[PDB]
Amino acid sequence: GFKQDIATLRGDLRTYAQDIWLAFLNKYPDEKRNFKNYVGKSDQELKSMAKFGDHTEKVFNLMMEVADRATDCVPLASDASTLVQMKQHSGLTTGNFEKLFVALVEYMRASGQSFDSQSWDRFGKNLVSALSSAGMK
């Protein structure tokens, strides 16, 4: 289920984080505009860029904490407010997060592993609802 999936992802988090983030950026190429330095680079090149690996892992470090603190795939209001108020998320709208979790769920469905893809789909929707409620446009 959802909780075990958190453990599975945390057991190889840098690799899962990079693979899911790349699935997101490759499914939605315009999303690279939010990072600038990722433009014009293949996956293997991005994986050799220090900030890509370090920032992407930290993204998923926090994502797993928010998932772990959720109840029935519904994140805490305080976690949603943190994601809205982060200076690094100044530009973002809920659409950016919706697309990320579409790609994450698609990644899990295509995976050979028994991820609870439906729970991650609910989590993505519930997180988008919470971000909107906490003031993200």
Ligand code: HEM
């Ligand atoms: C649950 C989902 C997300 C979580 C937990 C999360 C978390 C984080 C964290 C921890 C950082 C700091 C990284 C660092 O400074 O090393 C960060 C930075 C950033 N995030 Fe998010 N993020 C999420 C979703 C998104 C999405 C969907 C986008 C855009 C499509 C986004 C755009 C950015 C940008 C532009 C930065 C700063 C620039 C950069 O790190 O290169 N984030 N995020």
